[PDB]
């Protein structure tokens, strides 16, 4: 030289615590882781897933831281676981983240560281190469944151713130188935893967968720928271885207992207975130119850898933418303 430291962690958802613103310164821271893976389951038925883461969751853891510172881281792977991982962170710159460097594978370980610167939320996550995614988417891653330183614021510146926291894551896833348906388962892781890748491729897933498962947150688991418160948431897612948211618420413030620087923105419702991425838312519450948471869409958320848851617590018113017346037838 420176111172460282360380932271723990925691787981888611939661976161770880811491613171937102510161014163213180730177520173480185560381952580740680681980891865893982497983498985788971896712738911508820059971488914388961495987898943892976880162530790374990888903896412893862868340881381924181511111812103410138550184961161460281370680991663671880174980071984057980097986795968391987790583891563991737966002934040951162380069290488890518880173992753390369881371890676590782199983066991281982590584470381790383870175620174941161930127711130816001952112894623891581991994991847591985081939693977991445796967990862892523498973798981994984978550876121881271951151934161510125012161714290936161618105637109114106015012310141713111928261319270818391948481976271968520887412896722988406794938798963596967077978033949018968268914778913498936695986044991292993591988185996698963392839288937897862294828378912992634277808895208779509299955588932987404958230954390891881488915628930888861728821218940117890778911977250818581018251019324018043614030818171913141975160978411894341890476892959994817968504978404975121928451218911019821718402935112316010826121941132998504988340880143822181710117410114936112318130118110828202938702928202976104893217994937991958993360963111963121815130818121716160018122018222118480229960828411828831897621997303919206738803398917996714428911268905698947994713878402948641948271828861718141417280118280019533019535015024715001019622019714018145129732229805018537017567
Ligand atoms: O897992 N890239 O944010
Ligand atoms: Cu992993
Ligand atoms: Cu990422």
Redesign the pocket.
Known sequence: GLPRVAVDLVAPPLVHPHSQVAAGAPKVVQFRMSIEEKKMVADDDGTTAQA?TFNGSVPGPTLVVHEGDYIELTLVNPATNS????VDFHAATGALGGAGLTQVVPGQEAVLRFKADRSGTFVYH???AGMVPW??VSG?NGALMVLPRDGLRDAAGAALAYDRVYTIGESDLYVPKAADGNYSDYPALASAYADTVAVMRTLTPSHAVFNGAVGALTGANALTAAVGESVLIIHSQANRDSRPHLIGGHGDWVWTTGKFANPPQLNMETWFIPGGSAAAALYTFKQPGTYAYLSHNLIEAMELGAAAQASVEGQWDDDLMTSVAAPGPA
């Open positions: 892976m795968m391987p991982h790583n991994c991847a591985p990862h892523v994984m």
